[PDB]
């Protein structure tokens, strides 16, 4: 118990220094990456029937 | 107190305090508040276009190729299928000497896939060779648990997640594990590697998921925020967030750089666990497959399901979209695999 | 005034048969988990042998029954070809369900292993042939008839020898399966009621067998009524021509065909079935 | 091209026609997964009907038994593989009062399994020998664990050998009876638990399974036709 | 987070009555059945009580009963457990365990080694 409770107290301070961004700034960064792909997401915006694979014979 | 015991447990109250003020310092707005002007995707009405059959027992893993048409799938039959998902026609079927399988992948070049289970062993099968079949080229061993997932990088480098609480990358010529990842308190369940190979995240039963450092074998940032055992995980296609599911009926979507939960899509008509997620290229839905026979289908800014997949007889034990983005494959425990767009 | 109730009653006869034989193929068609199980081939073949009855056999003879003569002429001879047959495939289909059931409980490791789809095709093909080869040979070749309207007297010998082979056997047959089923079904009740009541009595310190009596009573007695007396009666007129009426003959037969409607209410309802015929039909 | 679609349609059929044959072995054999602690008599009955494994034949039947022994004591996540095998022998020591109630509730927690439902056990209460040792004996008295047994009744329906002391046959029915109070407590027909006394040397073990099976399977199949 | 504090237990005569109570943070209280268990010295795991989802229904074991008490709280999120009548041999340390899954009446939690839902414990000791 004595050397998984050192090594746990370690692994928190590393956690705990690390840098954060703002969660507007995180939300802002989907935002840009959805609209980005949009129009070349298939099962977003429905492809026709030619060009389906899983429709044509 | 003076007692080493109580000092560590100070500073570890100590440490949960100042994590969990940095955490809500940073929480100034919701992604509700920030998704509530976007327009909704509207109601999406998949349907099943192919279904693949065959399997004798509840398939339990499935992971589609680079080329977006050939996919492997894992049951406890002793099977492991390749298919061609354009012809429904089968390429492969390899019989496994343990008939407890619980993981499958399929390498980003096309060359080997991998699996595992309660044999505590990852088995590679090489499907280009020179006699003729697909046969046993490697076999990692080295477990004390069972194995739960395993996704390559590379046709040499594999990380491996396993119920001994631990995940290995492995090199699989030398079958030595070139790096080990230990921290867990339960059982890992599922992993999956970010696409620019550098980074990847796992989800434990103990109600956390770790994000790890490939090659340096450090656990960067842990997450707290599912009440029971993560059963599902997957990165956005971007590389910086991804979303889990759990036995507490809730998918969780965290974010790496902000280092906290964003959003939590989940329904009080919705009781039974969570066994598979998965985005798509664009991140903006959010597939997930659930112990109440379906597969729902959700808005990943907006919390809004649109669609369901009833077609499973039983639980739905796994799934996973396309790299083309073009389908979304579901497999379940009542042996059968279906296609979806 | 009674002609068009009988017609209307008639009528409805047969569109219940139609529709819940249909309902039963259809469940069977668009669903193929249903199909999956070895032992629904039976109730498939069940239901098709009834679908049959109310297509081939049920509207004409509503239709020269309403009319009061026979309107098609020719058909006549064909029709009572369909009607032996038809009928015949279904208590036939009945007995060997019933078979095939004591085959599942009477010796539970064999029938896993034994029971693959050809042997439930080979059944199949027994039943459907041995009642093709009873009603369109001998009718073909007017053996049935003893030596408009359509006369359907049969023969003398011919009504005993198509008895004994489409009743008599498959009800002999039936009932001996049953008895040893209800026989096996008493001696698991009594074992689990010894535990029970030991646990009870830890615990402090009829049901199981009424319902198994009334599911063997309900499968046999329902048959039995719908298909015995005409039977005998088949037996016995020949040998009159005390005697019967033509119409108590008439609506003895129909007590006969009636077996067909009622068939997929007993034999079809399953966990399974009901949730298929919930989802198809809405 | 088409020529690519032929052959990957006779891949297809070779591929099926091997499954079809692999259906057939796999539709006969009866897996049955053993559990139950350890210093138990399991794994001396795994040695006995002659490690992971074991497969053996009764009148011409399969059977491929499973203890799931190089895990951790974690049985949960992988009790989920088990799901569809014919049946659970859960092994139980009777001589021991305190690991008893550590079976009983392992037993609770397999019976109410949500993945369970339809899963029957095979009960063995093993070292009756060695439980009439220490009934005899008189020092470790089951009321002192088992409050209970000093209301105890001996069953009406109690089969005593030959010579056995009432003390023990009280004794192995009150045992019999706390793990029947479990499985009557929420069975309600769908699976069912056939208790057995066994000691160290006897050998009809295989027999008694395979009985157990027959009657599994034949009261699944009157539940299947709606009689039981 | 999942959180488990036990709380109460320390140095009493036999025959004394003492109340546990475990905090519980992390989850809707309503939604798991609960467990206390103890390992005593030079021994093992063993289970104690078990309380379910909303009280209906309780169990303990043969070598406590009659004694033994265990009590749940949802609104306020706290499990309790009363001991009346100490015995010599009821010096354990005391775990409150969260049954793993919710909406089930399955538990897989004397896990001696280690498990995901339990508190650090309490030390409980009786002697004269
Ligand atoms: C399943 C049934 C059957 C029914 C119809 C047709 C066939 C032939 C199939 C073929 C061999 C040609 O491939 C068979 C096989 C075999 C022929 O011995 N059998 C049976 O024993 C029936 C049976 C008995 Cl007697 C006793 C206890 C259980 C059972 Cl189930
Ligand atoms: C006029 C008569 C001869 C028509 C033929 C009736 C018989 C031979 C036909 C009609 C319906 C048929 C069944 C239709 C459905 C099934 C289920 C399928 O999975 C296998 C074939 C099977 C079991 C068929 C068996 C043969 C069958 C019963
Ligand atoms: C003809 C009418 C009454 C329908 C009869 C169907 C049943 C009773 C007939 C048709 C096929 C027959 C079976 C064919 C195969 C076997 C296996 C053999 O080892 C014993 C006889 C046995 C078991 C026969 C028993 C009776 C049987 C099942
Ligand atoms: N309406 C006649 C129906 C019928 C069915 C079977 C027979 O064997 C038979 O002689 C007559």
């Known amino acids: 118990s004595i050397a998984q409770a050192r090594k746990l107290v370690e692994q928190l301070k590393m956690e705990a220094n690390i840098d954060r961004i703002k969660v507007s700034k995180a939300a802002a960064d989907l935002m840009a990456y959805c609209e980005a792909h949009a129009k070349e997401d298939p099962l977003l915006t429905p492809v026709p029937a030619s060009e389906n694979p899983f429709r044509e014979k | 107190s003076g007692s080493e015991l109580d000092q560590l447990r100070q500073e570890a109250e100590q440490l949960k305090n100042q994590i969990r003020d940095a955490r809500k310092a940073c929480a100034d707005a919701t992604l509700s508040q920030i998704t509530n002007n976007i327009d909704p995707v509207g109601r999406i009405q998949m349907r099943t276009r192919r279904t693949l059959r065959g399997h004798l027992a509840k398939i339990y893993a499935m992971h589609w190729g680079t080329d977006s048409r050939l996919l492997v799938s894992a049951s406890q039959d002793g099977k492991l299928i390749i298919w061609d998902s354009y012809t429904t026609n089968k390429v492969h079927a390899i019989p496994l000497r343990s008939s407890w399988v619980m993981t499958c992948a399929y390498a980003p070049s096309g060359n080997y896939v991998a699996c595992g289970g309660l044999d505590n062993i990852c088995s590679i099968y090489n499907l280009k060779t020179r006699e003729g079949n697909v046969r046993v080229s490697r076999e990692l061993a080295g477990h004390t648990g069972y194995l739960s997932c395993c996704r390559f990088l590379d046709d040499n480098q594999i990380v491996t997640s396993s119920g001994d609480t631990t995940c290995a990358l492995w090199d699989i010529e030398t079958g030595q594990q070139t790096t080990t990842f230990t921290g867990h308190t339960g059982d890992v369940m599922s992993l999956s590697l970010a696409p620019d190979t550098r980074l990847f995240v796992s989800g434990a039963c103990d109600a956390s998921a770790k994000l790890w450092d490939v090659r340096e074998g450090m656990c960067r940032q842990t997450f707290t925020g599912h009440e029971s055992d993560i059963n599902a995980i997957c990165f956005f296609p971007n590389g910086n967030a991804f979303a889990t599911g759990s036995d507490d009926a809730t998918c969780r979507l965290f974010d790496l750089r902000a280092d906290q939960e964003l959003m939590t899509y989940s329904h009080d008509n919705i009781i039974c666990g969570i066994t598979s997620v998965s985005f798509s290229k664009s991140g903006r839905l959010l597939l997930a497959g659930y112990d109440d026979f379906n597969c729902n289908v959700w808005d990943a800014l907006k919390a809004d399901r649109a669609g369901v997949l009833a077609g499973h007889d039983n639980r739905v034990s796994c799934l996973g979209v396309t790299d083309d983005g073009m389908a979304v494959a579901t497999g379940s425990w009542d042996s059968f695999l279906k296609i979806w767009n | 005034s009674v002609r068009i109730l009988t017609a209307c009653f008639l009528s409805l006869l047969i569109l219940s048969t139609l ?76 007995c060997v369900i019933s078979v095939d059931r004591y085959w599942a409980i009477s010796s539970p490791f064999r029938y896993e292993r034994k029971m693959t789809p050809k042997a439930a095709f080979i059944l199949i093909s027994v039943a459907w042939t041995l009642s093709v080869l009873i009603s369109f040979i001998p009718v073909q070749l007017s053996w049935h008839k003893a030596k408009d309207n359509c006369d359907s007297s049969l023969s003398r010998t011919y009504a005993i020898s198509s008895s004994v082979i489409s009743f008599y056997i498959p009800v002999a047959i039936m009932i001996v399966t049953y008895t040893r089923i209800y026989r096996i079904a008493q001696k698991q009740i009594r074992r689990i009621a010894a535990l029970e009541r030991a646990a009870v009595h830890a615990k402090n310190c009829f049901k199981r067998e009424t319902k198994v009596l009334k599911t063997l009573s309900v499968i046999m007695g329902v048959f039995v009524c719908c298909w015995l007396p005409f039977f005998i009666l088949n037996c016995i007129l020949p040998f009159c021509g005390f005697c019967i009426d033509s119409n108590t003959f008439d609506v003895f037969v129909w007590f006969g065909w009636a077996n067909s409607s009622l068939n997929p209410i007993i034999y079809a309802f399953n966990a399974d079935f009901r949730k298929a015929f919930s989802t198809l039909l809405g | 091209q088409r020529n690519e679609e032929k052959a990957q349609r006779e891949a297809n059929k070779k591929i099926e026609k091997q499954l079809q044959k692999d259906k057939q072995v796999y539709r006969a054999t009866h897996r049955l997964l053993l559990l139950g602690a350890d210093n138990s008599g399991k794994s001396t009955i795994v040695k006995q009907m002659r490690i992971f494994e074991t497969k053996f034949q009764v009148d011409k039947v399969n059977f491929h038994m499973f203890d799931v022994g190089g895990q951790r004591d974690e049985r949960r996540k992988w009790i989920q593989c088990f799901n569809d095998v014919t049946a659970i022998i859960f092994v139980v020591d009777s001589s021991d009062y305190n690991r008893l109630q550590e079976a009983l509730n392992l037993f609770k927690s397999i019976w109410n399994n949500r993945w369970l439902r339809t899963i029957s056990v095979i009960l063995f209460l093993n070292k009756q020998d060695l439980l009439a040792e220490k009934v005899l004996a008189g020092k470790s008295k089951i009321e002192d664990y088992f409050p209970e047994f000093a209301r105890y009744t001996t069953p009406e329906d109690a089969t005593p050998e030959p010579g056995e002391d009432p003390r023990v046959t009280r004794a192995k029915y009150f045992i019999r009876d706390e793990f029947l109070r479990i499985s009557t407590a929420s069975g309600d027909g769908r699976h069912y638990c056939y208790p057995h006394f066994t000691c160290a040397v006897d050998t009809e073990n295989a027999r008694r399974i395979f009985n157990d099976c027959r009657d599994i399977i034949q009261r699944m199949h009157l539940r299947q036709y709606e009689l039981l | 987070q999942v959180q488990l504090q036990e709380s109460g237990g320390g140095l009493v005569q036999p025959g004394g009555s003492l109340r546990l109570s475990c905090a519980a943070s992390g989850f809707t209280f309503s939604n798991y059945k609960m467990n206390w268990v103890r390992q005593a010295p030079g021994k093992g795991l063993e289970w104690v009580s078990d309380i379910s989802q909303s009280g209906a229904s309780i169990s303990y074991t043969g070598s406590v009963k009659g004694r033994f008490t265990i009590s749940r709280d949802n609104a306020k999120n706290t499990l309790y457990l009363q001991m009346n009548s100490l015995k010599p041999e009821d010096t354990a340390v005391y775990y409150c365990a969260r049954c793993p899954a919710p909406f089930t009446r399955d538990c897989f939690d004397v896990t001696s080694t280690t498990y995901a839902y339990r508190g650090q414990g309490t030390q409980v000791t009786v002697s004269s």
């Open chain 3, 19 to 94: 529709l819940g034989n249909t309902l039963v193929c259809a469940a069977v068609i668009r669903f193929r988990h249903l199909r999956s199980k070895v032992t629904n081939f039976f109730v498939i073949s069940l239901a098709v042998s009834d679908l049959l009855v109310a297509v081939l056999v049920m509207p004409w003879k509503a239709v020269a029954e309403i009319a009061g003569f026979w309107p098609f002429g020719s058909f006549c001879n064909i029709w009572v070809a369909f009607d032996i047959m038809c009928s015949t495939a279904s208590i036939l289909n009945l």
